[PDB]
Assembly symmetry: C2
Homo-oligomer: 158 residues x 2
């Protein structure tokens, strides 16, 4: 089953989470104008844990052609990923209350200038780099989530 | 008044906050080993606000030679800064319950591979880039902090 990978945008990703980027986003000038502050880009949410967690996930690149078969979901908290050095990366998402609703499965490749923030219960493929090793700053609950199998998918670019 | 800038390290910065880096830090292997997760790097803390905020601060470079004279502190929450593209940056910190205790004033230059996380009430100079424009991913309360003047300081490298 082929799954076309589309460019990442806030509009197309609205149902799964937030896109962390500055392009076409509102900001406040701070100081003489030395700093531009692009406020509230991602809705962080953590349940059953007063403290949020900041970590660094160093993910290896995946074998090409990419072909996922599993999906995870964190019902207890959101999870953000921001490339450490501005590298491009891929994400696969899907909705569904019980199991992943295949009709809502989507694949997105970033422009190398945007991060991502998965909303609670959103199904997404486990982290993996694209082309070369990559460091991702993570912002989530990360405690102890839900893995589910799906019909093998072969990601395509076109 | 000259102020020598020392290399940033967790040991020397322990009293002001946390250093977000992977070097010599403990991590868990995830998957067959595709991802390495370096858990809890920074103590995020927010008061009088259920939600944490994630934004991007685009700071202009400062005029050389660097010479600060003000210091701010956020009594209500911590504040993290992580360079977007791995660029080096400088930080000035100091403690003190009421006003900045000048005997604890310190300046630090990062190695371009580390972020920083200011603890509550810690005095730090407002954000500014080094050499060239820089994007910083921020993680704080950012509401509406306390600015205080100090004897002019000229930062030096040696």
């Amino acid at each position: 089953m082929k799954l076309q990978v589309l460019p990442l945008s806030q509009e197309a990703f609205s149902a799964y989470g937030d896109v962390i980027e500055t392009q076409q986003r509102d900001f406040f000038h701070i100081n003489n104008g030395l700093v531009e502050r692009y406020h509230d880009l991602a809705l962080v949410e953590i349940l059953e844990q007063d403290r949020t967690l900041i970590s660094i996930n160093r993910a290896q690149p995946a074998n090409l052609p990419l072909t996922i078969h599993e999906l995870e979901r964190h019902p207890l908290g959101t999870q953000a990923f921001i490339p450490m050095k501005g590298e491009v990366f891929v994400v696969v998402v899907a909705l569904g209350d019980d199991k992943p609703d295949l009709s809502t499965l989507r694949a997105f490749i970033t422009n190398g200038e945007q991060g991502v923030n998965y909303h609670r219960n959103v199904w997404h493929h486990p982290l993996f780099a694209w082309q070369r090793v990559t460091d991702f700053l993570t912002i989530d609950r990360g405690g102890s989530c839900d893995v589910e199998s799906i019909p093998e998918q072969e990601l395509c670019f076109a």
